[PDB]
């Protein structure tokens, strides 16, 4: 200390404060990830049949589910930088607009989808048609700071 917390509260300032820096680095990462995740989605929806027989890259969908599941909770931690019980609920409760209600429904679906097992080809359809399907919305939820699409 005193980093240790003045470094996590620093993460929770940077990801939350719209600036030239948030815009520059964060939105390069969202486009890079969406292209990776969608090329991987075309592969993954065939790897799901390879998972009946053989070895497969399908494990990396659980890795990116842990990224996106963590990335949802990381916003709840930037509710207020130290607020990690308080606004951890309080901003989730605030998340009332249409995409935010869908994002809440899809994050609990995404955990249930891991939790049923990597089969049920519904884990597969939800990885696709839930956890890619949310990401196309973020193009319009685009946090690149113009008052976007309105």
Q: Which two tokens stand for residue 33?
A: 């990830």
Rounded Cα distance, 59 and 99, in Å: 27
Ordered DSSP codes for 33-85: HHHHHHHHHHHHHHHHHHTTTS--TTHHHHHHHHHHHHHHHHHHHTTTSS-TT
DSSP symbol at 82: S
Length reported for the chain: 150
- Would you list which residues are annotated within the binding site? 145
| Cα 20–chain centre separation | 22
Give the three-state DSSP class for 53.
Answer: coil
Extents of the domains making up the chain = 1-150
Give how far Cα 61 sits from Cα of 17, 33, 110, Å. Answer: 30, 12, 11
84: closest CA among 96, 70, 74, 93? 74
Rounded Cα distance, 37 and 58, in Å: 12
**H or E element at residue 91:** helix 86-93
DSSP symbol at 146: S
């Amino acid at each position: 200390v005193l980093a240790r917390t003045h470094v996590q509260g620093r993460v929770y300032n940077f990801l939350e404060r719209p600036t030239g820096w948030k815009c520059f680095v964060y939105h390069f990462a969202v486009f890079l990830i969406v292209l990776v995740c969608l090329i991987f989605s075309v592969l993954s929806t065939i790897e799901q049949y390879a998972a009946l027989a053989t070895g497969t890259l399908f494990w990396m969908e659980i890795v990116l589910v842990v990224f996106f599941g963590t990335e949802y909770v990381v916003r709840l931690w930037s509710a207020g930088c130290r607020s990690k019980y308080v606004g951890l609920w309080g901003r989730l409760r605030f998340a009332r607009k249409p995409i935010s209600i869908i994002d809440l429904i899809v994050v609990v679906a995404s955990m249930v989808v891991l939790c049923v097992g990597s089969k049920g080809q519904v884990f597969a359809t939800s990885a696709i048609r839930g956890i890619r399907f949310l990401q196309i919305l973020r193009m319009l939820h685009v946090d690149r700071q113009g008052g976007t699409w309105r």
